[PDB]
Amino acid sequence: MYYGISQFSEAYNKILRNSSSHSSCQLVIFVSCLNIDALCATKMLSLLFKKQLVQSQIVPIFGYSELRRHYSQLDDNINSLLLVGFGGVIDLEAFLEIDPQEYVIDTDSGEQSFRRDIYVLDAHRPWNLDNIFGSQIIQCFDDGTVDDTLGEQKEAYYKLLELDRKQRKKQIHEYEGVLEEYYSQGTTVVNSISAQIYSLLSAIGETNLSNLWLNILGTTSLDIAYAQVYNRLYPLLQDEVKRLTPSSRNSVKTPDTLTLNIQPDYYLFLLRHSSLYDSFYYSNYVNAKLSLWNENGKKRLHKMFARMGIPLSTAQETWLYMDHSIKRELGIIFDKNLDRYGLQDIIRDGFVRTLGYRGSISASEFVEALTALLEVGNNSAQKLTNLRKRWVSNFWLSWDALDDRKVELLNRGIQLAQDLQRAIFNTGVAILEKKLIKHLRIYRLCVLQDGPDLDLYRNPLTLLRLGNWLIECCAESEDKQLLPMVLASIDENTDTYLVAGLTPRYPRGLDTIHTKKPILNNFSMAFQQITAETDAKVRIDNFESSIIEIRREDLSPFLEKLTLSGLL
Amino acid sequence: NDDDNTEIIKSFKNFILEFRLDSQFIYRDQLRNNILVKNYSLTVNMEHLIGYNEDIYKKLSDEPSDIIPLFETAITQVAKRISILSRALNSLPTFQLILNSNANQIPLRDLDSEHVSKIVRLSGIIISTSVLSSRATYLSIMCRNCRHTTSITINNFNSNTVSLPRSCLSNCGPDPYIIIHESSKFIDQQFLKLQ
Amino acid sequence: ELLPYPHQLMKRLLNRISMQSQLIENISMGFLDNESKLPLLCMETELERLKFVIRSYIRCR
Amino acid sequence: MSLPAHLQQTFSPEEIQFIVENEPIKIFPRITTRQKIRHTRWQLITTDDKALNNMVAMRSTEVVLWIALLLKQQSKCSIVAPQWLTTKELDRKIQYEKTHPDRFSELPWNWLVLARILFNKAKDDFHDPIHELRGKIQDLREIRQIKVLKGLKYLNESHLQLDNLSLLEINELRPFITEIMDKLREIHTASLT
Amino acid sequence: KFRYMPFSPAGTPFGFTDRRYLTMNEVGYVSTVKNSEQYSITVSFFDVGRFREYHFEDLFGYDLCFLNEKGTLFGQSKTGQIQYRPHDSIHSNWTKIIPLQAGERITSVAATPVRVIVGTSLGYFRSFNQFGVPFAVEKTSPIVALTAQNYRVFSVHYSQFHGLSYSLSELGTSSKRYYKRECPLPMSLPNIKDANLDYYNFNPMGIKSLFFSSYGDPCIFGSDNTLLLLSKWRSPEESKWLPILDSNMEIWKMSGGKETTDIHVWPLALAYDTLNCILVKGKHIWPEFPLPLPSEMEIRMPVFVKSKLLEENKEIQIPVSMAAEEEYLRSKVLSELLTDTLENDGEMYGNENEVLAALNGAYDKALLRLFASACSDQNVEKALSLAHELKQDRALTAAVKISERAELPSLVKKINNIREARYE
Amino acid sequence: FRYMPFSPAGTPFGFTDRRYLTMNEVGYVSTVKNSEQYSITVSFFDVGRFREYHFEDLFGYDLCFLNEKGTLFGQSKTGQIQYRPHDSIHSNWTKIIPLQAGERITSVAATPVRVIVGTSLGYFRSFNQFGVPFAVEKTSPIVAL
Amino acid sequence: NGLDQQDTNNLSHQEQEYLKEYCDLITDLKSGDLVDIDLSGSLVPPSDVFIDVRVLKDAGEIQTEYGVFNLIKDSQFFVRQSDVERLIQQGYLQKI
Ligand SMILES: [Zn+2]
C-alpha cells in the first residue's frame, strides 16, 4: 500500500516541499497522450500548481521509449515527476533501469531521498507489486481497492522477496502461481483518474465547480470503456454536485451566471447541437439496436420516427432550431415510444452545463468534441515521429479547448466529431454489407486494406472508435456470443498494418450477474507472448498494449500464431 | 393585447440591452456604430435570441410578419433612449432589423404550399434586379372638406396594401383624407428574382 | 519640451533599486540553503514595476 | 527606437492600468500576517510594509492595488468594493448625468479601469449582482460619450475644459483633440500678424 | 411556554433551501446540505493559512457543530451523539454519544483545548477531555447557549422558573474557577413577521449569536440586535454589562430616515475597535449559502436621540455636541477595557500601549471640545467638572485657552488652581 | 407586565384633578392638571431652608424627584428631563434622554454627586448634577430607583 | 540588437557603420550605470511574472538563473517572466 488514499495529501505536501522553489523549477509533468481523463488530471494539476505558484514543465507523451529517452533528457535536479495512468502495471523501474543507490541521498534510522522523485498515478488494474514496491523512487498512488484485495498477492510477493528446501521451494512456486493468476490478465480501469484526483483536491479542500466539472468529463470519457464504473461513480458525482450547487434556485439566466444541471440525457451524440435524425443516425447503440447499418435499419428508423409522430424534415433539422413547444414534450414521447421499441434504456440522467446565453452542452458532447480534436486536430519511423508530434499538437489543442474562452475551438471539435462519426458509420456499414468481418471462433477478425481515410483510421483513436461501434453492433446481436475483437488497418505510407486488439464488451444496460464480471483483454497477453518469441517486429511503444503496429507482410504469421495461441 | 404587445417590445429591448458576451454588449456596439454612420439598421442573430430567451424567439417564429415591426419600434425607442439626451415622429428614422439564420435551406424547388408567411432560409442566383421603389413609412393626409389632417405610419409587413382612410375619422366622404405627399416620408424598395 | 533632470531624485532611486536587488539576492541565496515565499515575489514585482517606469522615463527623455 | 511614436503621443491603456495598480485599495486579509507575542517581511520601498506586516484575516486593511490583485489571484486576499461602485451610487450618478446634460459627474477618474479589473477578478466579491453593474457602467460610459459629442459641437481655438471626465476617456481622446486644437491654434497664429 | 430548541452561535436555520449554516465563528464558518439521505458537513475557514477545508458526510446529520483552533465538535441533540475532530486532525477523530433521558435535547455544545463542554435542554452538564474522557457530569440550569475560548468559557442558563442566568468560567490550563456564577442576565427576549417566527422555531430565545470579542470578553447579540458588552469581568463585583451597540440607530443613520426591515446582521466576532459583522439585503434574518463579505461596523452606544437627529436632518446629520458625547464615552469605556486587559493579561500584540495613548489623547480632545461647549453654555460648574475629568496638564493649558477665548477669567484661574493641584 | 412609571411617595391623578408627584422630607410637591398644562406647587417642608416656589409646567413631567441639591422633573413618555436646584443658585438645566422604541422612564433619581434615570428597558444612565452623562448601563427593567 | 533587414545590401556602407556604432553606443548606455534596468526593456507594463508557456520549437535545455529548463517541443512551462520574455525575443517560446 505505497500511497494511502488519505496519505495522498501527505504525498502532495512532500512533493511541494521537495519542489518548494519559486526560483528554480523542480517539477516535470508526464502525461499519456490521447487520454481524456489524463487531460482532465493535467488541468487539475495545473490549477493546483498555479494556486501554489510552483514552477513546472508539462510534457505530453505517447510512447514508452519516448518516456525513457525524455527521462534521459531530464535533469537530475527535478525532484518531482508525475505520471498519469500509463505504465503502472509494467515495471517502470525495470523499464527505467534506475539505481536507487545513485538516487538515495542520506540513506541513514533510514530515509530515502532522491534528486528525482517520480510519482505515478495509474489507471491500469494489474498493478504490479514489484512496480509498486520494488523501488521507493517509484511512487505509486494506490486506490487501496486493488491493494487490499492484493494482500494475499502482496504477502506472496513479500515472501518471494524474503526467499532469494522442498517445502520452501514449493511455497515459492505456489506464490509464483498466484503471480501468474493476477498475471495473464487483461488490464482495465476501475477508477477514473479525475475521480481520485478530485478526491485529493477535496482532501485539500480546493475543489471548485470546474474541478467537479472536469471530473465529470473524465468519468464520462471512461463511461464507454467501463459503463459499470461510470454508473458506480455517478451517485458520488451527483452528491458532490449537490455539495457544490449554488443556493440560488431557478434564477433568471444572465450572462454572468453559469449553471451545471443533472437532467435526463439521451445516448445520442451531439443531440443538442446536432439534429434529431442524425443524432439517432450515428449513435452506435441506436445503430446496433436498430441494425441501422442495413436498409431495414433505416426503414425501422423511419417507422419509429413516425411513431413519435415527428415530421421528418423537422427531425433532420437541428435540435437547437427546434421549436421548444415540441422540445419540452420530447422526453415523455420517448418514454411512450422507446419502450415499445425497447429503446428506453438510452434515456438516463446526465450532467449538462451551461454558461450565460451560450447554451447547454452535454458532458458527453464535450468529451466527443475533445476526442474529435485529439483525433483530427492536425523515414517511416520519422513519419511516425511526425504523427506523434501532430498527436501531441492535437493534445495541446484539446487542452486549450478546455478553456472557457475557446468556445469556437469547442465548436470546431464538435464539427470534427460529426465528421468522424459520419466516416466511422460509412466504414462500418461498408464492412458489414461486404461481410468483411471473418470470425475464426477464437476472435472475430476484420482488416482494413481498401477504402479511404486509412490515414484517419491509422490514428489509434479512430480505430478505437470504430472498434467500439462494431463491438456494440456485435453485442446487440445476442445470437452470436461475445468473442475477441481483432482489427488491422493498413497505411500505405508506412506500408505496414496497424492492429488493435479489442476485448469483447457486454451491451449497455446488461445488469445480469454474468455481465457484472468484466472481460479482461487477452489481446495484450497474446501480443506480449508474440513479442517474447517469433516476434513479427510489432511496436508496443504506445501506451496501449492492444494497439500494435506490425509489418503488413508479417501480420499473416501473426494471425497464424494467434490461432495457435490458446489464451485468446 | 396592445399593452401586451408593448410588454413584448420591452422584453425585446431587454434582450438587446442585456445580451452580452464577455461583458461585451455587441448590440449596443453595432447600435453606436450605426449612430456614428447613420445607417438606421440593426443586425441580430436568432441563435443569440434563443440563448437569451427561447420564448421571444418562438413568438417570433409564430408570426414574424407582425413581430418584426414591434422589434423595429423597440430598436427605435432604444436608439432614442441611448443616443439622445433625456428630456432634450420622423425626428429619428426607424431602424430596420437584419437577421442571419444559419438553419437549413429548403431548396427553391420543392417549396411547399405550406410555409406561407413563415420565415425561411434559402439560396439562389439573381437573374434580375429592380429599380428602387419608395414606400410610405409616414403618410400625410387631410380630411378634404373636414380639413382634418392626420398622420399614418404604415409598415411593409402585411400581406395587399392598407386601403386609404374612410369616413371623416374626426359626411366627409369615403376617402376625405387626401394624401399630401410632402410631409409623407418614403423608403425605397427593390425587387429581386432568384434562380 | 524636455524637463529638468532631478539628479538627486534618480540617484536616490538608483540606490533604492540596488539595495532592493541585493536584498532579493540575499533572500534567494538563503532559500538556496519562511515557508511562504510570496513576500519575496511581491518585492520582485515592485522592483519590476519601478524598473519598467524608469525605463519608460529614460526612453522618453 | 528610443520610443514608438504612438507611445509618446498618449499613454497606452496598459499604462493606465499600471497607474491604477499604483493606487491603494481597501481589502480583507485571509492571513494573519501579525505574529503572536505568545519569518519574512515585505520590505517594500514604494509602499509601507508595516501594514503588510500587520494583516489579520478578515480585518480592515488598505493596500496598493497591484499587490491586492496578486494576492486575490491567490486564495489569501479578499477585496473591498468602492462606495461609488455601489449600485445605489451608480443610480444616483446616472440620474445626475441625465439631470445635467451640460456637465459630468464627479467620478473617480480611474473608475473605468477599476471596474474593468474588478469585473475581471473581483466578480465573486461584488455584493450586488455583477451583470447589472456592468450594464450601469456601460450606460454611464455611453452618456459620457454623448455629452462629449455635444462638446465637440463647441470645440474652441482658445480654451477647452473638462471637469469630471475619466482618465481613460481623456487619454483615448487626447491625440485627436490635441491635433485639432493645435491645428486651430496654428491657423489663428497664421491669421495673426 | 418554552420550546428549548437547540441554538448554535449565529447558526443559519434550515430554511427552504436544503443547505444551511451550522455555526458562524471568526475561526471559520460551517454549513451543510442534506443529500436527500444525510447532511454534507463542510468545515470552511476564513484564514486559509490556519486550516484547509475538509468536507465530509454523516448519516447522523448532527444538529449542532462547534469548532475552534484546535478541534471541532458535532452534536446531534435527539440522538445525543457527539463527534469530535481535531482541526489539525493529526490526532485521530473521536466520537461519543452522551446519555440522555426520553425526549432530552442538547441545546448547545462547546469545545476548549482544556475541556469539552456538553450542555442539554435538561440542564445536565458534562465535562470531557480533548480525547473523549469525561471530566465529570454535573447538574445545571438549562442553557440557551455556550461561549468558549482557549480557556475562557462563558455559560448562560435559562429556566422559565429561573429566568435568564449566566456564569463565567475561567478554566485555564487547570484549576478551573468561575468569575461569575449564574448571574441574572439582562436581555430583551423577542415579543410573541414570518422570518422571526421561523428563527424562534430555530432559536426561541431569539439571540442571534454569543461569543467573545477580539480580546475575549463576552459579547451577547440578541433579538434587540444591539449587542451588550461586559465590562471588567475580571473583577466579579465590578463587572457589569454596558450597552455597546445601537444597531437600529446605526441603520437609521445609514438608511437616512427610511427604516428597512430587510437589514439583518450576524457578528461572527467582535474586534475591540469596531464590530466585524455581516448584513443581508433580504427578508431572511439568516445569511445565505453564497457567503457575503462581512462589513466592519463602528461600535457606538445608543445615546443618540431620534427626535434630535431628525431635527438635525431637517447621511444623517449629527450634532458635534452629541457626536462628541458619544465619542468621549466610547473613549472612556474602551480605555478602561484596554487598560484592564493590560492588567490581567498584558499586551496581545505589543501595539496596545500606543493605541491606548492615542485613545487617551482623543478622549482629552473630546473633553476639551466639551469644555468649549460648556463655555458656550457659559457655566463655571460645567467647565470645572470637565477640568476634573481632564487627565493631562497640557489639556489643562488647553482648557485655560478655551476659557480665555470665552473671556471668563474665573474659569481660567480655577483651571490654573487645578493645574497646581495636578502638579503634585 | 404593564410597567407604569413610579415616583417615590407619589399619588395617582385618579378622580382628583390634583395630585402629589412625590412626598419627600425636603418637600412635598403638590400639583394640579389644568387640562392644557400641569400646574405645579413645589412645596417645601422647610421653607426657611428653601423658600416655597411653584411654577406652571406646560410639559407635565410625569416623574419628579426633589432633594436639597435640586428638584428634578421628568416626563416618562417624552424622555426630556428638567432639573431645578432647590438653592436655585445654579441654572435650571434641562435635557432629554435617548429613548428606545416604546421605552419609558419608570423611575427618577436625583443626587448631588450624580443624576440617575430609571427607564422601562432597564437602562441605567449616570449623569452629573449638571446633566453631563457620566455613564450609561443596561440591566433588567428598573421599576423602582 | 537591443531586443536581442538583417542583410546590409539595402543599406549603404556609411550608414552601415553608423548603425553599428549606434548599437555600440546603446550597449555603452547599457554598460556601466543603468545596467540594472534593460535599456531596451519591454515598454509594455508587466502583467504577471509567472506564466505558463508552451515551447514553440524544440531546442534542448537552456540554462535559466536557477531552474533547469529543457525546450522540448510544445511543452507547457509555468515560470517567472524574465526567462519567458528573453526566449520570446528569440521566439523559441509562444502562446504567452
Ligand atoms: Zn372630416
Rounded to 10°, the helix E393-405/E380-389 angle is 160
CA distances from G29 to A364, B178, G22 (A): 60, 86, 11
Contact B47/A320, CB-based, under 8 Å?
yes
DSSP single-letter state for residue B122:
-
The residues pairing with E384 across neighbouring beta strands, listed in sequence order, are: none
- Sort strands A27-32 and A56-61 into parallel, antiparallel or unpaired: parallel
Please tell me the distance from the alpha carbon of residue D153 to that of residue A382, in angstroms, as a whole number.
69
Please tell me the distance from the alpha carbon of residue E19 to that of residue E35, in angstroms, as a whole number.
9
Number of domains composing chain A: 3
| Domain of residue G53, residue span | 43-96
Nearest of F20, F56, F22, F23 to residue F37 by alpha carbon: F56
Cα torsion D82, D85, D86, D91 to 10°: value is 150
Asked whether G65 and G37 are in contact (CB, 8 A), the reply is no
Contact A20/C37, CB-based, under 8 Å?
yes
| Domain of residue E6, residue span | 2-303
Q: Which is it for the CA torsion A422, A423, A426, A429, positive or negative?
A: negative
Please tell me the distance from the alpha carbon of residue F99 to that of residue F84, in angstroms, as a whole number.
22
CA E313 to chain centre: 31
Please tell me the distance from the alpha carbon of residue C21 to that of residue C51, in angstroms, as a whole number.
11
Based on the fold, state whether residues E295 and E314 are members of the same structural domain.
no
Based on the fold, state whether residues E256 and E382 are members of the same structural domain.
no
CA distances from A236 to A231, A233, E39 (A): 10, 5, 14
Backbone angles phi, psi at A482, to 5 degrees: -70, 130
Give the minimum alpha-carbon distance from E224 to chain A in angstroms, rounded to a whole number. Answer: 28
Please tell me the distance from the alpha carbon of residue E340 to that of residue E343, in angstroms, as a whole number.
5
CA of B152 to the centre of ligand 1 (A): 15
Residue G77: helix, strand or coil by DSSP?
A: strand
Residue type, A12: Y
Place of cell 541585493: C22
Number of CB pairs, chain A paired with chain C, less than 8 A apart: 11
Number of domains composing chain E: 2
Number of neighbouring beta carbons within 10 Å of residue D193: 4
- State the DSSP string of A125-141: SS--HHHHHS-SSEEE-
Please tell me the distance from the alpha carbon of residue E162 to that of residue A430, in angstroms, as a whole number.
90
Based on the fold, state whether residues E193 and E93 are members of the same structural domain.
yes
Place of cell 532469494: A164
Asked whether A402 and A39 are in contact (CB, 8 A), the reply is yes
Please tell me the distance from the alpha carbon of residue D55 to that of residue A297, in angstroms, as a whole number.
71
Residue type, E373: S
CA distances from A190 to A9, A85, A196 (A): 21, 12, 11
Residue A540 cell numbers, joined: 508496443
3-state secondary structure chain E: CCCCCCCCCCCCCCCCCCEEEEEEECCEEEEEEECCCCEEEEEEECCCCCCCCEEEEECCCCCEEEECCCEEEEEECCCCEEEEEECCCCCCCEEEECCCCCCCCCCEEEECCCCEEEECCCCEEEEECCCCCEEEEEECCCEEEEEECCCEEEEEEEECCCEEEEEEEECCCCCCEEEEEEEECCCCCCCCCHHHHHHHHHCCCCCCEEEEECCCCEEEECCCCCCEEEECCCCCCCCEEEECCCHHHHHHHHHCCCCCCCEEEEEEEECCCEEEEEEEECCCCCCCCCCCCCEEEECCCCCCCHHHHHHHHCCCCCCHHHHHHHHHHHHHHHHHHHHHHHHHCCCCCCCHHHHHHHHHHHHHHHHHHHHHHHHHHCCHHHHHHHHHHCCCHHHHHHHHHHHHHCCCHHHHHHHHHHHHHHHC
Residue A515 cell numbers, joined: 455481465
Please name the residues in contact with D68: beta carbons below 8 A apart, sequence gap of 6 or more: D25, D27, D77, D79
Please tell me the distance from the alpha carbon of residue E38 to that of residue B152, in angstroms, as a whole number.
68
Partners of residue B52 in chain A, C-beta under 8 Å: 253, 357
Please tell me the distance from the alpha carbon of residue E183 to that of residue F140, in angstroms, as a whole number.
12
Please tell me the distance from the alpha carbon of residue E294 to that of residue D28, in angstroms, as a whole number.
9
Contact E40/A246, CB-based, under 8 Å?
no
Could you tell me where the beta strands, DSSP code E, fall in A33-167? 56-61, 80-84, 104-105, 113-114, 118-121, 138-140
Based on the fold, state whether residues A131 and A103 are members of the same structural domain.
yes
Asked whether A568 and A522 are in contact (CB, 8 A), the reply is yes
Boundary of a domain, candidates A228, A246, A264 = A246
Based on the fold, state whether residues E231 and E318 are members of the same structural domain.
no
Residue A512 lies in a domain: yes
CA of B147 to the centre of ligand 1 (A): 6
- Resolution of the experimental model in angstroms, please? 4.5
Nearest of E127, E113, E119 to residue E100 by alpha carbon: E119
Alpha helices in A247-376 (DSSP H): 277-281, 284-290, 295-308, 312-316, 324-327, 330-341, 363-376
Please name the residues in contact with E386: beta carbons below 8 A apart, sequence gap of 6 or more: E367, E370, E371, E374, E399, F132
State whether residue E296 sits within 8 Å of chain D by CB: yes
State whether residue G64 sits within 8 Å of chain C by CB: no
Reading phi first (left if > 0) and then psi (alpha if -120 to 50, else beta), residue E392 is in beta
Based on the fold, state whether residues E64 and E167 are members of the same structural domain.
yes
Please name the residues in contact with A57: beta carbons below 8 A apart, sequence gap of 6 or more: A25, A27, A28, A29, G69, G70, G72, G75, G76, G77
Please tell me the distance from the alpha carbon of residue E392 to that of residue E387, in angstroms, as a whole number.
10
Residue E171 cell numbers, joined: 478554566
Asked whether E184 and E192 are in contact (CB, 8 A), the reply is no
Chains A and G touch (3+ CB pairs under 8 A): yes
Residue A154 cell numbers, joined: 502482496
Partners of residue A357 in chain B, C-beta under 8 Å: 19, 21, 48, 51-52
Give the minimum alpha-carbon distance from D146 to chain A in angstroms, rounded to a whole number. Answer: 27
Cα torsion A453, A458, A460, A464 to 10°: value is 60
Boundary of a domain, candidates E281, E303, E325 = E303
CA of B139 to the centre of ligand 1 (A): 17
Residue type, A212: L
Based on the fold, state whether residues E296 and E326 are members of the same structural domain.
no
Residue D71 cell numbers, joined: 494576492
Contact C41/G34, CB-based, under 8 Å?
no
DSSP single-letter state for residue A503:
P
| Domain of residue A332, residue span | 273-343
CA A306 to chain centre: 37
- State the DSSP string of A157-184: HHHHHH---HHHHHHHHHHHHHHHHHSS
Rounded to 10°, the helix B64-83/B54-62 angle is 130
Residue G8: helix, strand or coil by DSSP?
A: coil
Based on the fold, state whether residues A44 and A138 are members of the same structural domain.
yes
Give the minimum alpha-carbon distance from A254 to chain D in angstroms, rounded to a whole number. Answer: 7
Please tell me the distance from the alpha carbon of residue E65 to that of residue E57, in angstroms, as a whole number.
13
- Sort strands D61-64 and A27-32 into parallel, antiparallel or unpaired: unpaired
Based on the fold, state whether residues E203 and E225 are members of the same structural domain.
yes
Please name the residues in contact with A246: beta carbons below 8 A apart, sequence gap of 6 or more: A259, E289, E290
Number of neighbouring beta carbons within 10 Å of residue A402: 21
Residues in chain F: 145
Q: Which residues of E360-373 are buried (b: 16+ CB within 10 A; e: fewer)?
A: bebbbbbbbbbbbb
Q: Which residues of E77-90 are buried (b: 16+ CB within 10 A; e: fewer)?
A: beebbbbbbebeee
Nearest of E250, E195, E242 to residue E220 by alpha carbon: E242
Based on the fold, state whether residues E278 and E352 are members of the same structural domain.
no
Alpha helices in A377-512 (DSSP H): 380-402, 407-433, 454-458, 460-476
- State the DSSP string of B60-109: HHH-HHHHHHHHHHHHHHHHHHHHS-TT---SSPPPEEEEE--S----ST
Rg (CA), chain F: 14
Residue A212 cell numbers, joined: 467537479
CA distances from A325 to A226, B106, E226 (A): 36, 22, 55
Based on the fold, state whether residues E254 and E400 are members of the same structural domain.
no
Please tell me the distance from the alpha carbon of residue G94 to that of residue A301, in angstroms, as a whole number.
50
Based on the fold, state whether residues A211 and A326 are members of the same structural domain.
no
Based on the fold, state whether residues E168 and E76 are members of the same structural domain.
yes
Please tell me the distance from the alpha carbon of residue F132 to that of residue A12, in angstroms, as a whole number.
65
**Cα separation of the two ends of chain E:** 62
Based on the fold, state whether residues A487 and A387 are members of the same structural domain.
yes
Backbone angles phi, psi at E239, to 5 degrees: -60, 140
Based on the fold, state whether residues E277 and E258 are members of the same structural domain.
yes
Please name the residues in contact with A337: beta carbons below 8 A apart, sequence gap of 6 or more: A304, A307, A308, A343
Backbone angles phi, psi at A118, to 5 degrees: -115, 115
Residue B136 cell numbers, joined: 410610405
Place of cell 499538437: A393
Please tell me the distance from the alpha carbon of residue E147 to that of residue E168, in angstroms, as a whole number.
9
Q: Provide the residue ranges of all domains of chain D, joining segments of one domain with +.
A: 3-192
Based on the fold, state whether residues A287 and A225 are members of the same structural domain.
no
Place of cell 376625405: B176
State whether residue D45 sits within 8 Å of chain G by CB: no
Asked whether E219 and E270 are in contact (CB, 8 A), the reply is yes
Edge to edge, what strands does the sheet with F115-118 contain?
F107-110, F115-118, F123-127, F133-138
Based on the fold, state whether residues A492 and A450 are members of the same structural domain.
yes
Residue E414 cell numbers, joined: 480655577
Based on the fold, state whether residues A479 and A533 are members of the same structural domain.
yes
Elucidation technique = cryo-EM
Residue E83 cell numbers, joined: 463527534
